[PDB]
Design a binder for this molecule. Structure first.
Ligand SMILES: O=C(NCCOc1ccccc1)c1nc([C@@H]2CCCN2C(=O)CSc2ccccc2Cl)[nH]c(=O)c1O
Ligand SMILES: [Mn+2]
Ligand SMILES: [Mn+2]
Length: 180
């Protein structure tokens, strides 16, 4: 069974993002052909993480999202055993070598604070920085420290709203928004 959402994802995101999202879902035992909204969300979260890491200087961020579970944890352990930073209970998305902290990036279709509360209490790791992006152009980071300059963040917000328009143009946005 082939959904309209599945074919939209493959034409909307670059193949390296799609392949990484596919491997991500399969590693956790879900199939992109059925759980299509989830497939779209993982591609989106991946692209945002990559744009985010592109916003700093050359080698400011270590990218943890997009790796297999074991090597991701391997890099985290290396980062911790070299900077003394506390070991997060859950896999973060990046490490900021400049600010010496892990970051978990969130992309939500809800209000940015409704999702922030859940992502905070769920991680409970007081050390891991949180940066939420919404599909409506709103953002929220811990301690109002948005890490990057405004221009890098604005590019992420533009892209998120483009994805929203393209889904809505294809009548997939409603099913997507009511699926989170
Ligand atoms: O790394 C993460 N999970 C580890 C990997 O998880 C799966 C779980 C099922 C399938 C594939 C990966 C992670 N997960 C969440 C949410 C809440 C915890 C589980 N989860 C979700 O399954 C929402 S779909 C999601 C999943 C990954 C990344 C981005 C998205 Cl949006 N949000 C994040 O920002 C995030 O980085
Ligand atoms: Mn992650
Ligand atoms: Mn994340």
């Amino acid at each position: 069974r082939g959904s309209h959402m599945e074919d939209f994802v493959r034409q909307c995101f670059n193949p390296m993002i799609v392949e990484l999202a596919e491997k991500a879902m399969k590693e956790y035992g879900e199939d992109p052909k059925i759980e299509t909204n989830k497939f779209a969300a993982i591609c989106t979260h991946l692209e945002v993480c990559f744009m985010y890491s592109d916003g700093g200087s050359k080698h400011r961020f270590e990218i943890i999202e997009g790796r297999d579970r074991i090597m991701a944890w391997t890099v985290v352990n290396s980062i911790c055993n070299t900077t003394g930073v506390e070991k997060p209970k859950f896999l973060p998305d990046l490490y900021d070598y400049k600010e010496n902290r892990f970051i978990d990036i969130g992309v939500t279709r809800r209000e940015v604070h409704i999702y922030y509360l859940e992502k905070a209490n769920k991680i409970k790791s007081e050390k891991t920085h949180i940066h939420i992006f919404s599909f409506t152009g709103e953002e929220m980071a811990t301690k109002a420290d948005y890490t990057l300059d405004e221009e890098s963040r604005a590019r992420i917000k533009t892209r998120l709203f483009t994805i929203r328009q393209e889904m809505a143009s294809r009548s997939l946005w409603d099913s997507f928004r009511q699926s989170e």
